[PDB]
């Protein structure tokens, strides 16, 4: 159960905003200007790391 809980927590936190506009990477890539895209991508990276 602990293992399943850890894995589920990881998968669930894959969808966290972490201060970004959206949790979907492709949406930000195809939706934002390259500097703002870099900023939001860096935020998501910090959260996922």
């Amino acid at each position: 159960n602990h293992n399943a809980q850890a894995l589920n927590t990881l998968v669930k936190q894959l969808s966290s905003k972490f201060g970004a506009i959206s949790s979907v990477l492709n949406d930000i890539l195809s939706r934002l200007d390259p500097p703002e895209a870099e900023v939001q991508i860096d935020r998501l990276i910090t959260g996922r790391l």
Partner: protein, 294 residues
Amino acid sequence: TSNFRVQPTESIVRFPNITNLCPFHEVFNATTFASVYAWNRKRISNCVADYSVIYNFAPFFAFKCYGVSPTKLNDLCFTNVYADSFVIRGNEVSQIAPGQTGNIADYNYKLPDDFTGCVIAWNSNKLDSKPSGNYNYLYRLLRKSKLKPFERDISTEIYQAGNKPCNGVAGPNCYSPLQSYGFRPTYGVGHQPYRVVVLSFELLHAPATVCGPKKSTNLVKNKCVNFNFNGLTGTGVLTESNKKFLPFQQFGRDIADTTDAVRDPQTLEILDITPCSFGGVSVITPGTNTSNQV
């Protein structure tokens, strides 16, 4: 050592069918315009959205897109397309920006700080100035408090600067907030009339209804392709699924908070989305001095 992502082979776009077009014209050629305090907000919905007509028009003084990349406008789908047409002075164009404060910004029309869309401002000085005077265009420079985002105030409230109401008459601490623009052909940039259309977009989980032209290539089942089903872009393998979606919508998801199943804008067929096969590669080798076979 490395991964093994099964690279996709083809691409399928399955944007829904409407094959019609957008008002996008009567929100730009419209003979007459609106004030900044009294600004026409039209909701464009059900369309194909060919933004080529925008580029077909006159050059734009400030064609600044905040939430969306200007070149990628046709590719993504948007729920509601909004046309906000009004006339403001040239130096006041900069005030129409998310996170930027100014008289026109706060007392006439405040965009949201997280606004997503495009502001299309072009000079319209070719035919806006008349000898009589362009008093039709008006703006508010006094209000009790700051305007909330996407708010309209057209009522003329008596400015009660003092502790006693002005009672609707002129006197000390009694000034009308409304001010009429003065438009002259010989005036430089900053006082010349500028036509500004604000395209407000709203990305959310309702049917696109407005999605730049793209023809859907046919579907490809058991295989590994990109899918673009009403704006949700991804990678996976489309397989027949036994799930029975209620008529509500198509964005099927599982416990992993991932798009497990989706419905297409053709049949209401529900396809389960599974990730394309991938894994990690490992090299089993003996000692390097022993042999080089791996």
